[PDB]
Amino acid sequence: VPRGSHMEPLVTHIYTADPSAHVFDGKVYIYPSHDIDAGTPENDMGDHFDMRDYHVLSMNSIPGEVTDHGVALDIKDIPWAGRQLWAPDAASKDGKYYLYFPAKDKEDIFRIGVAVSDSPAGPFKPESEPIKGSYSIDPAVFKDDDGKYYMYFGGIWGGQLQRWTTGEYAGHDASKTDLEQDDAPAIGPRIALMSDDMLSFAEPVKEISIVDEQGNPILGGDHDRRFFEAAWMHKYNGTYYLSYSTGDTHYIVYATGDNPYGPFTYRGVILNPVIGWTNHHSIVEFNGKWYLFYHDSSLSGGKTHLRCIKVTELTHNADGTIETISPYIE
Numbered sequence: 559v560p561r562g563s564h565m566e567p568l569v570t571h572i573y574t575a576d577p578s579a580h581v582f583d584g585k586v587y588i589y590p591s592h593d594i595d596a597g598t599p600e601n602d603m604g605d606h607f608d609m610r611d612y613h614v615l616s617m618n619s620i621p622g623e624v625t626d627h628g629v630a631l632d633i634k635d636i637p638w639a640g641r642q643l644w645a646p647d648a649a650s651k652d653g654k655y656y657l658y659f660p661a662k663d664k665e666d667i668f669r670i671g672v673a674v675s676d677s678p679a680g681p682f683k684p685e686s687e688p689i690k691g692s693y694s695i696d697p698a699v700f701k702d703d704d705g706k707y708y709m710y711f712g713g714i715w716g717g718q719l720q721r722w723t724t725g726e727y728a729g730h731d732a733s734k735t736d737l738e739q740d741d742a743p744a745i746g747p748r749i750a751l752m753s754d755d756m757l758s759f760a761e762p763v764k765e766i767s768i769v770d771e772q773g774n775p776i777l778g779g780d781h782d783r784r785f786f787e788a789a790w791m792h793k794y795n796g797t798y799y800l801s802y803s804t805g806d807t808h809y810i811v812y813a814t815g816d817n818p819y820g821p822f823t824y825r826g827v828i829l830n831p832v833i834g835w836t837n838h839h840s841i842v843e844f845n846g847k848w849y850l851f852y853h854d855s856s857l858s859g860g861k862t863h864l865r866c867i868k869v870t871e872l873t874h875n876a877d878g879t880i881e882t883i884s885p886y887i888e
């Protein structure tokens with residue numbers, strides 16, 4: 559049956575989260591986390607998110623029937639991974655398809671790995687080790703118009719980004735939150751140009767600067783605006799749009815810049831808070847319309863770790879501003 563017409567759950571037979579939507583072969587392919595009711599301890603490090611595989615979804619139209627392509631990747635087959643298959647993304651280059659995924663290694667440190675297929679629907683063969691120089695969570699692999707591909711990544715608190723300031727992991731007894739210096743600039747998300755073969759980074763990882771309208775850095779204490787997790791990049795009318803979740807304040811916000819590396823100027827809210835703690839999205843153009851894919855905990859009756867993906871139309875103004883979406887109005 560067709561789905562996606564009135565902000566209803568796109569699938570109900572499994573729980574799904576963190577949707578990364580792409581247009582491949584004229585279809586919408588969605589790469590979400592597959593939530594399961596593991597019953598693991600709930601805490602601020604996210605141990606309650608205990609996912610173990612990925613399913614690829616696809617739609618030929620929006621609204622449309624949603625196809626579940628089965629298990630695209632299983633944690634048991636990822637040689638380096640210990641636990642926790644968190645928010646993934648995919649990319650397409652030269653007829654190969656790449657699934658990028660955050661997981662904890664055997665030392666309980668989040669890294670980002672890649673798995674490879676000849677189909678957007680998978681299944682995918684994981685590389686034996688994670689990407690060298692990767693860390694933390696929430697990859698978004700963005701193809702710019704010039705054919706260059708960039709990985710945006712990072713998440714604070716349970717995502718461990720705050721433990722990576724030196725290029726080496728600070729340890730399990732290091733900060734559980736952020737820099738703990740609210741008058742310093744907030745931690746920024748990470749970017750690296752991808753290698754030609756899509757398996758590695760082509761440069762040292764860079765941190766992205768996010769500033770306010772006056773050009774001042776967004777500060778660590780500004781939880782309404784500062785980066786938490788779920789980075790996403792899209793381009794519209796020559797402008798680069800870095801969008802992301804603010805975590806404990808539950809917004810998807812966006813900031814604009816003139817190149818992939820920023821700096822990005824905070825503009826406003828994309829998506830107001832949903833049912834359930836997390837808020838995670840993607841923004842994609844399909845048949846000349848822009849869509850926001852997102853999730854909530856509505857299907858599970860409000861369980862933060864049992865989510866369902868949804869979609870709605872997103873409206874850019876010609877001046878580059880985006881109309882804020884409030885999820886439960888209309």
Ligand SMILES: O[C@@H]1[C@@H](O)[C@H](O[C@@H]2CO[C@@H](O[C@@H]3CO[C@@H](O)[C@H](O)[C@H]3O)[C@H](O)[C@H]2O)OC[C@H]1O
Nearest residue numbers: 601602603604714715716717787806835836862
């Ligand atoms: O890595 C991320 C985790 O850090 C993130 O953990 C959430 C942190 O907040 C938790 O909710 C708090 C519970 O205590 C109340 O008093 C506070 O007001 C709440 O904010 C929430 O349950 C955790 O999920 O989850 C997402 C991960 O990506």
Ligand SMILES: O[C@@H]1[C@@H](O)[C@@H](O)CO[C@H]1O
Nearest residue numbers: 591607644645787836838
């Ligand atoms: O990586 C995501 C994170 O952004 C948050 O949504 C919790 O679930 C994880 O899968």
Ligand SMILES: [Ca+2]
Nearest residue numbers: 645696697788
């Ligand atoms: Ca994502």
Ligand code: NA
Nearest residue numbers: 826827881882
């Ligand atoms: Na707004």
